[PDB]
Amino acid sequence: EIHTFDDIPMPKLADPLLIYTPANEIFDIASCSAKDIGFAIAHAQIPPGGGPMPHIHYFINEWFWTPEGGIELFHSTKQYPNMDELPVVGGAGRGDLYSIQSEPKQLIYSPNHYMHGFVNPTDKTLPIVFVWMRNEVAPDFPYHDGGMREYFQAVGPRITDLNNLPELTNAQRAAFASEAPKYGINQSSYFMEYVNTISDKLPAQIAKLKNDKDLERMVEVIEAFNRGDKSVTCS
Amino acid sequence: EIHTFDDIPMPKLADPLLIYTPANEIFDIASCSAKDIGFAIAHAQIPPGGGPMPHIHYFINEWFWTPEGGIELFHSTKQYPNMDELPVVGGAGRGDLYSIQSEPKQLIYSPNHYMHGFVNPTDKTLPIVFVWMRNEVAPDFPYHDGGMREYFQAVGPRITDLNNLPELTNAQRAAFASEAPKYGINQSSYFMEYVNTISDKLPAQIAKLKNDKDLERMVEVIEAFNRGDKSVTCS
Ligand SMILES: [Cl-]
Ligand SMILES: [Cl-]
Ligand SMILES: [Cu+2]
Ligand SMILES: [Cu+2]
Ligand SMILES: [Cu+2]
Ligand SMILES: [Cu+2]
CA B30 to CA B192: how far, in whole Å? Predict the structure, then answer.
């Protein structure tokens, strides 16, 4: 059974940060913080075939929200609490992944240390929204968001015109993987690097992952920011 | 149980055709024909992470020979006899793949219509040898080999210096997928395009695939060519 969510609004910044990530994702991204919480959020468009290779977070917890479904996510049952141990053939070993064919407005919650990724397997561009919440061990980044917006900003070209995207380069793709550990991500550079099997039978243990409480709080922050409330910041 | 083979020699051409394929493979490639048979052969080096996305052949039967193992192959049980039907989410449906952790000198045989691919999942460059034999429905290509050398030559940059490789480009990667049908290949442009599941339990039906008779014949052709025999041609 799926977990759903009705609305995750976007912080409306004066000059929107639009980034074409080296995973082939069109991001409208921002960071927000409040006294109690810090996070990055992106409303994204995923072209056919787009999406990041399997990766693991150490500084954030992630939410995926798929307003139109279509997106296929991949998720482990196994957790990788040690950033020093890559799940690779020569070391800690590659992991098993389970796929999720997302449904309209499905909300998927993925705590730090789980391996995940996703792809647009369809022939049309699909929307997706991410929230990356700063966890309790994350270092303080300039935007106090746990590091994710700084990551994308550092590795992906900035977009001017959505109808004339930057050409992603080899260096950008390599940097997307190699710069990732400084932002608390172990990011694979090809699909099967960290991967042993992909299975379509979803374990209940993954399906049940949920953190609505933190998400509703961050929505409050976003909506307050959009109302002009000065006790929160988004930029 | 694995099928092994001791030696697949390379046709020694005056000026070797070295191609850096857009799948990140370093090819030393040639075509050979004789009265009875026609084929392309490549001795290749696969950098970490290199290898083609899942694809299906219509003009050739393929052999993979892994002198040092390490290479991980992916192979279906299902066959796709209709080139007009792509195994995609909007159409004929994505297929199940089974992985093979190759062993030194293992020989894997893959008849037309099967879906396959492979990757170097290790942190070192690994050798691999391919033979693509012209089947009975293949159109006549300029080298009478069933189309594969013409394909790689058309879509991949030619190498000058193995220590200073060409930079693969976006257009080359796109062309590797989009030009493929003219060479009798349905080639996916990302790993999960044609793929539903990847499983590590190999069905006996795939393991048993074998065509040593045709391979030994093509080795004869190669060895004759290298002895200067004029009744066969390699170039
Ligand atoms: Cl492994
Ligand atoms: Cl499907
Ligand atoms: Cu629920
Ligand atoms: Cu993530
Ligand atoms: Cu055998
Ligand atoms: Cu092939």
Answer: 31
Element (H, E) at B21: strand B17-21
| Euclidean distance between CA atoms B96 and B74, whole angstroms | 10
How many Cα atoms occupy the beta-carbon half-sphere of B215 within 13 Å? 23
Does A62 belong to an annotated binding site? yes
C-alpha span between A71 and A103 (Å, rounded):
8
* Technique used: X-ray
Residue ranges covered by each domain of chain A: 1-235
Strand B195-199 and strand B95-101: pairing? parallel
CATH entry 3.40.50.1450 includes domain B1-235: no
Q: Show residues of chain B in contact with A190, CB under 8 Å.
A: 49, 119, 191
Q: Residues of A near B (CB-CB distance < 8 A)?
A: 49, 72, 88-90, 94, 99, 119, 121-123, 167-168, 170, 189-193, 195-200
How far is B159 from B21, CA to CA, in rounded Å?
Answer: 10
Structure tokens at A216: 């509703």
CA–centroid distance, A114 to ligand 2, in Å, is 25
Q: What does the DSSP assignment read for A151-176? A: HHHHHSPBPSBTTBPPPP-HHHHHHH
